[PDB]
Structure 1
Amino acid sequence: QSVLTQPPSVSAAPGQKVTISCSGSSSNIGNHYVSWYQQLPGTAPKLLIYDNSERPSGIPDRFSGSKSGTSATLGITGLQTGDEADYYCGTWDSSLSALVFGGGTKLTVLGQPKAAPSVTLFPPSSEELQANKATLVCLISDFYPGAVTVAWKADSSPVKAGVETTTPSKQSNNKYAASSYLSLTPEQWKSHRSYSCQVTHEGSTVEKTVAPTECS
């Protein structure tokens, strides 16, 4: 995925402080200046921090950056709901000859209780199998904060091909849901003993498993 490593998710209540780390190597953060980009939901990224620790006009001093060795850190004090966003670190990498980014961190400003996800896994319907297709549908519901990681397993081996996953969005009850799809051929579906949808939320992984030969 991305060259720089960021935590997927950080959260704290309004008025608290958080830090978001960015881990790299000599050829990127080690030898070059780190910038930070803020992406508010449904907007283009914007420059937050440049030259490791400098603020553009209009960025308040609640926002700070530092770099040491092959790591960088963004600090946010006096957290407020308007800070809720995806944050990306960036730098130059002299070894890839490329501007590189971290994978992004979703910052949640906590406004409701934390809730571990419910995970509902549907095997391919008889009807879809008879149309010669096979989709596993992993429905992930009633969680907060709105940030998950989804991994699919065929028996015990990871599957990366045929995977599509939606960005969490709010349910009527104000908690988050998200969906993930694993697209197989009927041949692939029938030729494994089981498939699993693994969801990682905060300090929990919840995994559901279905089997071609079992009534799910």
Structure 2
Amino acid sequence: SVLTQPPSVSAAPGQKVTISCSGSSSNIGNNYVSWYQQLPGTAPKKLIYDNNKRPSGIPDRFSGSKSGTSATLGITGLQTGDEADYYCGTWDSSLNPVFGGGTKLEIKRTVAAPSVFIFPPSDEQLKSGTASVVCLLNNFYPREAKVQWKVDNALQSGNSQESVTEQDSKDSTYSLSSTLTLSKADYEKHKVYACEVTHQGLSSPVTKSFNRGEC
């Protein structure tokens, strides 16, 4: 990670983005610049080689240019499948491979309200002596979301962990999973377990809850 790229870039479907790559004299200045696309969970795939050239398979929506110690990747006609990390690459003064830090592409779309689901702990986990409560926020945009756990109307803090998927390949939305974990003993000292969700697409906070023992 020697070359400099912007942390992220964003535009709407059908629009155009450009990702710059800033190096110096010894690398980008003297040598050819390559570009890669890395979809989440996959190996990097080359889009551009020798500053400007596309290998077979790569659509002409992708293009590249080089000017001094700076290179640029261009993506025209954005599609929802274009969400990925994009790296620039070249050779250093010793002709060894060097890469940029990467750039996250985010497709800008219309605001989407999250679907909220909640999952009581399973009997199998209960038998082991633990209770994990899961709250699902499905297919929303933008990314920001507030999830608050309430146990008998007591707000939980530092008691839960969440993670967010990468932007969906179809509708460019996000999903969020929050897990609240209690000991079996503590789980059986309370009745109402609730998940409270705040999002831009929600006129008011949505709450999903269950009582211990009804499932």
Report the secondary structure of 2:88's partner residue. strand
Compared CA separation, residues 167 and 51, structure 1 to 2 (3 A): farther
1:105 pairs, out of 94, 103, 106, with 103
User: What's the RMSD between the two structures over aligned residues?
Assistant: 2.9
**Inter-CA distance 177–4: structure 2 relative to 1 (3 Å threshold):** farther
Question: How far, CA to CA, are the matches of 1:3 and 1:46 in structure 2?
Answer: 19
Runs of 4 or more, structure 1, over 2 Å off, are 111-114, 142-146, 166-171, 174-178
For the Cα contact (< 8 Å) 1:33–1:52, is it kept in 2? yes
- Residue pair 1:144, 1:176 contacting (<8 A) in 2 also: no
Q: CA deviation at 1:167?
A: 8.0
1:93 aligns to 2:80 (yes or no): no
- Listed as ranges, the matches of 1:50-199 within 5 Å are 50-94=49-93, 97-113=95-111, 144=142, 168-169=164-165, 175=174
Report SS of the residue matched to 1:27: helix
| Corresponding letter in the other structure for 1:80 | Q
Hey, what's the Cα distance between the residues in 2 that align with 1:99 and 1:20? 20
The Cα of 1:41 is off from its aligned counterpart by: 1.4
Q: Percent sequence identity over matched residues?
A: 77
Per the TM alignment, residue 111 of structure 1 is displaced from its structure 2 partner at its CA by: 2.7
Unmatched segments (≥5 aa) in structure 1: 115-141, 147-165, 179-216
Structure 2 counterpart of 1:169, one-letter code? T
Structure 1 counterpart of 2:82, one-letter code: D
TM-score normalised per structure 2: 0.54
**Structure 1 residue matching 2:81: 3-state secondary structure:** helix
Q: Is the 1:110–1:145 contact (alpha carbons within 8 Å) kept by the matching residues of 2?
A: no
TM-score (norm 1): 0.53
Q: Structure 2, unaligned stretches of length 5 or more?
A: 113-139, 145-161, 168-172, 178-215
